[PDB]
Amino acid sequence: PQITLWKRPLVTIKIGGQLKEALLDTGADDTVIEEMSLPGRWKPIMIGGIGGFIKVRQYDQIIIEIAGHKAIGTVLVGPTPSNIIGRNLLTQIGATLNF
Amino acid sequence: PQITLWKRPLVTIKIGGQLKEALLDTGADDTVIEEMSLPGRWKPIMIGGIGGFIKVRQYDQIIIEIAGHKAIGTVLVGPTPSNIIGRNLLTQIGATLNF
Numbered sequence A, B: 001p002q003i004t005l006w007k008r009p010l011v012t013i014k015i016g017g018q019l020k021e022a023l024l025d026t027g028a029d030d031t032v033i034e035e036m037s038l039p040g041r042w043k044p045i046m047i048g049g050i051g052g053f054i055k056v057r058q059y060d061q062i063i064i065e066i067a068g069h070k071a072i073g074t075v076l077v078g079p080t081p082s083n084i085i086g087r088n089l090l091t092q093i094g095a096t097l098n099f
Ligand SMILES: CCCC[C@H](NC(=O)[C@H](C)NC(=O)[C@H](CCC(=O)O)NC(=O)[C@H](Cc1ccccc1)NC[C@H](CC(C)C)NC(=O)[C@@H](NC(=O)[C@@H](N)CCCNC(N)=[NH2+])C(C)C)C(N)=O
Pocket: A023, A025, A027, A028, A029, A030, A031, A032, A045, A046, A047, A048, A049, A050, A081, A082, A084, A086, B023, B025, B027, B028, B029, B030, B031, B032, B047, B048, B049, B050, B081, B082, B084, B086
């Protein structure tokens, strides 16, 4: 599909057995999901953006479906203002920017 | 062009007649440039990012060239981690996400 940018590019994702809406973010290196109780081990890390840093839990090899496209990779979980799909997963679903 | 996302989608911009590098950011509503002298009038506002809110200067109707495509619109100037081209100008250059 093709997504125009008149409004925020939000799509449905499936992660941890839950459906969520998430923002496709070419300006995000990483994928950040709003606080949810994902199982298993994780690593504390801090991520940066506008406004400063926040503390997140880094989970590896998490299964995630993005607009119907399966992906698997590192997902960061914590108090983000939006679920964000970043380049680490956008590359796996073959997303490009075009103009 | 078509831009893949294995690296940050950085392009050349011209603003105030000066060349800069900026990130194409589909997760940004607005366009935010590092502190610079810029011709035109401005007003102070607040914008939020992943880590919190910052003060920026809002300039309207600013000419900006992005990867050799013309845009004219609102540019926010302030202490951002990166120059960012957001949806307000990505729509002007006809950018879409594709997968
Ligand atoms: C796995 C190792 C991680 C290492 C870690 N990496 C990072 O921190 C990397 C560089 N950060 C980033 O890439 C982060 C996303 C988080 C992430 O991917 O990790 N990107 C970002 O935060 C980029 C800007 C940026 C680019 C490059 C560098 C820094 C910053 N913007 C993304 C962000 C998405 C939004 C949901 C918060 N957009 C914005 O912040 C834009 N804001 C807006 O559009 C506002 N109008 C919305 C207000 C909020 N309101 C609300 N929810 N009601 C702003 C740029 C105008 C590190 N460096 O410590």
